[PDB]
Design an enzyme around this catalytic site. Structure first.
Site, PDB file in Angstrom:
ATOM      1  N   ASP A 268       0.785  -1.209  -0.066  1.00  0.00           N
ATOM      2  CA  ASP A 268       0.001  -0.170   0.015  1.00  0.00           C
ATOM      3  C   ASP A 268       0.860   1.158  -0.065  1.00  0.00           C
ATOM      4  OD1 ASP A 268      -2.484   1.635  -0.090  1.00  0.00           O
ATOM      5  OD2 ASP A 268      -3.088   0.870   1.725  1.00  0.00           O
TER       6      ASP A 268
ATOM      7  N   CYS B 289      -5.912 -28.611  11.550  1.00  0.00           N
ATOM      8  CA  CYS B 289      -7.066 -29.372  11.782  1.00  0.00           C
ATOM      9  C   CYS B 289      -6.662 -30.860  11.604  1.00  0.00           C
ATOM     10  CB  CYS B 289      -7.900 -28.945  10.661  1.00  0.00           C
ATOM     11  SG  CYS B 289      -8.852 -27.432  11.161  1.00  0.00           S
TER      12      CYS B 289
ATOM     13  N   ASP C 273      -7.655  -7.993   0.628  1.00  0.00           N
ATOM     14  CA  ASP C 273      -6.826  -8.175   1.754  1.00  0.00           C
ATOM     15  C   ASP C 273      -7.369  -7.615   2.898  1.00  0.00           C
ATOM     16  OD1 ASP C 273      -6.336  -4.884   0.982  1.00  0.00           O
ATOM     17  OD2 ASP C 273      -5.765  -5.133   2.864  1.00  0.00           O
TER      18      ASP C 273
ATOM     19  N   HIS D  23      -4.756 -21.791  10.679  1.00  0.00           N
ATOM     20  CA  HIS D  23      -6.247 -22.258  10.397  1.00  0.00           C
ATOM     21  C   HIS D  23      -7.002 -21.122   9.419  1.00  0.00           C
ATOM     22  CE1 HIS D  23     -10.081 -23.725  10.308  1.00  0.00           C
ATOM     23  NE2 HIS D  23     -10.507 -22.910  10.615  1.00  0.00           N
TER      24      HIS D  23
ATOM     25  N   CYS E 221     -11.677 -28.879   6.941  1.00  0.00           N
ATOM     26  CA  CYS E 221     -10.349 -28.072   6.458  1.00  0.00           C
ATOM     27  C   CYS E 221      -9.220 -29.189   6.614  1.00  0.00           C
ATOM     28  CB  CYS E 221     -10.083 -27.150   7.735  1.00  0.00           C
ATOM     29  SG  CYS E 221      -8.546 -26.304   7.647  1.00  0.00           S
TER      30      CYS E 221
ATOM     31  N   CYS F 118      -6.050 -28.257   6.534  1.00  0.00           N
ATOM     32  CA  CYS F 118      -4.873 -27.436   7.191  1.00  0.00           C
ATOM     33  C   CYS F 118      -4.011 -28.387   8.014  1.00  0.00           C
ATOM     34  CB  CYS F 118      -5.160 -26.273   7.650  1.00  0.00           C
ATOM     35  SG  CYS F 118      -5.594 -26.017   9.536  1.00  0.00           S
TER      36      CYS F 118
HETATM   37  C1  LIG Z   1      -9.466  -1.668   6.285  1.00  0.00           C
HETATM   38  N1  LIG Z   1     -10.173  -1.159   4.937  1.00  0.00           N
HETATM   39  C2  LIG Z   1      -9.510  -0.420   4.268  1.00  0.00           C
HETATM   40  N2  LIG Z   1     -10.010   0.450   3.373  1.00  0.00           N
HETATM   41  C3  LIG Z   1      -9.072   0.670   2.443  1.00  0.00           C
HETATM   42  C4  LIG Z   1      -9.085   1.835   1.373  1.00  0.00           C
HETATM   43  C5  LIG Z   1      -7.794   2.315   0.807  1.00  0.00           C
HETATM   44  C6  LIG Z   1      -6.547   1.598   1.198  1.00  0.00           C
HETATM   45  C7  LIG Z   1      -6.642   0.615   2.299  1.00  0.00           C
HETATM   46  C8  LIG Z   1      -7.728   0.236   2.931  1.00  0.00           C
HETATM   47  N3  LIG Z   1      -7.965  -0.796   3.948  1.00  0.00           N
HETATM   48  N4  LIG Z   1      -5.428   2.141   0.852  1.00  0.00           N
HETATM   49  C9  LIG Z   1      -5.323   3.181   0.357  1.00  0.00           C
HETATM   50  N5  LIG Z   1      -4.094   3.667  -0.192  1.00  0.00           N
HETATM   51  N6  LIG Z   1      -6.534   4.071  -0.122  1.00  0.00           N
HETATM   52  C10 LIG Z   1      -7.788   3.321  -0.057  1.00  0.00           C
HETATM   53 ZN   LIG Z   2      -7.879 -25.926   9.632  1.00  0.00          ZN
END
Ligand SMILES: CNc1nc2cc3c(cc2[nH]1)N=C(N)NC3
Ligand SMILES: [Zn+2]
Ligand SMILES: CNc1nc2cc3c(cc2[nH]1)N=C(N)NC3
Ligand SMILES: [Zn+2]
Lengths: 366, 366
Positions: free
Chosen positions: B93, B306, B263, B332, B301, B303
């Site tokens: 990010d 488990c 993510d 898990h 599961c 994994c």
């Molecule tokens: C947990 N929520 C979440 N909404 C997001 C929205 C963004 C982000 C990361 C985020 N995480 N990273 C950015 N650079 N801008 C938009």
């Molecule tokens: Zn598991």
């Protein structure tokens, strides 16, 4: 099949011995170091990782597991081995020491608050039966420093409790057939009491003999002094277990004095705290000098941590409070301890243990 | 050799897509879930364990690593991949979101206290270069709820920053040849702004397109409503990345709306807190009902957790605050998330994703 308990000494050098204990769940190479698994886990390590470091046997505690989760509960869930996923030998302490360090004494046993409970030789043996441990410790009464008279009364009671432990163990057919029982020598720093204790235990007869009452804040010189005369009193043909010891130098000097078995929390606990053991002595990985150090924790270590990760990375993890930091430090330190025991075993077998101990101390305390 | 960035869609069902992103460090199967590795670790997991669960790519953060240990420092130590021992793709990010949630804005960038620092499109791209990340996020300005006028100014600035991100990335030959750059759509809940944002980004041109500004406390109905019109505005032939999402049901519904990449910290964070994900919904392993439950966390599961450990044992570890508890719960939950993405990918490929989503929701919310 495998034998219940068979100790064989393959080589000696001075008072040092190296060999094997064969048990139903596996072979224990001696001198052995037992990682400590207080609450049915060796902290921050999967059992497969404990085994990967070289461990043949781990230590569990009657005291913690009788409270959490409970001995009957563990037995209902299939025994401690199944519960924690360690299928190799487990030695359990009797609860005598932890009852002290973590409350009313009598000849029957101890009553205490952890929330109100009682332990006795009979109850202690039964808990260890419920846990399914392979090496059962006798239940003993612990007290340091203490007068000659106090240590003698406390040693005497422990010897009466050892006979009750013996009888309780022998009354349980499945336990007597599948597990082993160790007695605990007491007597504090007094030679005459240590001799009376050794005689008491040898007349009862045990599969192995622990040296209790040390590693309780006495200093290495005094500890070695007591081992000097204490270990020779024990049966030579049975294993000798020094409870709660210790630092690497303590282990080496104890092996030179006839000890075969060891346990302590130092590699695990100080691992999580940032201390890493190396052949050049311990290092504190939090120190700023490691922030850009690309070398592995120890330049000779063969463990998985030293194959993959730098001091700089582990420095960062520990400073951040990251769980992976504790995992890697703990794996490395347990691997270090096992590599130390391996080098001890090989040097005795090859008749160069004296030279190993000299070379180890020169480099480690340089 | 392998390509820098190549996305191929192998199968569709409705708006859902499944396929691959080929990059120099590996292939990313989509829809993909990226475990979050905030401080250069996926908490409580070795990288080999992350990979064993099925993960193809992990997420790192410009914001945390520029402070601790520092971007130049990581570059001197050989890049983030070498530092943490993950050799597969890493998406970083840009710092825009974390700068907000963890302080002076302007057209040049943001200045903030964590202890005083500045970020900008140019500095953000350079940090991600120093880290060696494979998928670079454009630097954006984040704000919810917000007026149409506020969201429009904030979206407009993000679009000007996207062009500066593009130019900074393209000016760095080694980055442009070896990494990929994603733009971030903004516009809050307003359709017209989302369209203007999509147009801005498509005119600049990116390797993939993220949907920003969601998963910030808006509720699933509203989120789906925005995805409904937002995702179709993005280039169909490039990946679509929904940042910070989310719960398993959120993921399924987002895939039904055209998202390819995900993510969130939920599997890792709630793992350490005692929440385990199962096909029958989440369970709190601390609850007393699990104290004697010998079943594995989830009965299907595959994994490693488990296969070996009972709910009763993991219950005990978490109640005791044991590190191994956090390790097993985290492994898990990450495995669960990857098994969910696998089942999503197979069902789209086989043209039965609609039925999968129906069957999944019936059982999970039963
Ligand atoms: C947990 N929520 C979440 N909404 C997001 C929205 C963004 C982000 C990361 C985020 N995480 N990273 C950015 N650079 N801008 C938009
Ligand atoms: Zn598991
Ligand atoms: C850490 N020091 C230490 N000294 C010990 C001494 C004993 C013991 C455990 C120990 N731990 N367990 C017993 N049952 N009695 C003697
Ligand atoms: Zn090592």
């Amino acid at each position: 099949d495998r034998p219940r308990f068979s100790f064989s000494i393959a080589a000696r050098e001075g008072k040092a011995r190296t060999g094997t204990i064969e048990m139903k769940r596996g072979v224990i190479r001696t001198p052995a170091f037992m990682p400590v698994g207080t609450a049915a886990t060796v902290k921050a390590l999967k059992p497969e990782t404990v085994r990967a470091t070289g461990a043949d046997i781990i230590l569990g505690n009657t005291y913690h597991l009788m409270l959490r989760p409970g001995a009957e509960r563990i037995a209902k869930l299939g025994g401690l081995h199944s519960f924690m996923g360690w299928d190799r030998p487990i030695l359990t302490d009797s609860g005598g020491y932890q009852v002290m360090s973590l409350t009313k004494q009598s000849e029957e046993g101890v009553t205490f608050k952890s929330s109100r409970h009682m332990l006795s030789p009979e109850r202690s043996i039964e808990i260890q039966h419920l846990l399914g441990s392979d090496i059962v410790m006798a239940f003993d009464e612990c007290t340091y420093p203490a007068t000659p008279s106090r240590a003698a009364s406390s040693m005497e009671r422990s010897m009466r409790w050892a006979k009750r432990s013996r009888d309780a163990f022998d009354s349980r057919k499945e336990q007597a057939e599948n597990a082993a029982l160790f007695g605990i020598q007491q007597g504090s720093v007094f030679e005459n009491l240590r001799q009376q204790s050794a005689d008491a235990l040898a007349e009862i007869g045990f599969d192995g003999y622990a040296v209790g009452g040390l590693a309780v804040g006495e200093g290495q010189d005094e500890m070695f002094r007591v081992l000097d005369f204490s270990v020779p009193m024990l049966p030579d043909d049975k294993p000798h277990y020094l409870m709660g010891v210790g630092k690497p130098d303590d282990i080496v000097g104890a092996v030179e004095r006839g000890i075969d078995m060891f346990d302590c929390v130092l590699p695990t606990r100080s691992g999580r705290n940032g201390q890493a053991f190396t052949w050049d002595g311990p290092i504190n990985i939090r120190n700023a000098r490691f922030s850009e150090d690309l070398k592995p924790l120890d330049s000779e270590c063969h463990c998985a941590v030293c194959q993959k990760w730098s001091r700089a990375y582990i420095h960062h993890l520990i400073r951040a409070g990251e769980i992976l930091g504790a995992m890697l430090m703990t794996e490395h330190n347990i691997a270090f301890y096992q590599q130390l025991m391996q080098k001890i075993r090989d040097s005795i077998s090859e008749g160069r243990f004296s030279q190993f101990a000299q070379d180890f101390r020169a480099r480690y305390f340089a």
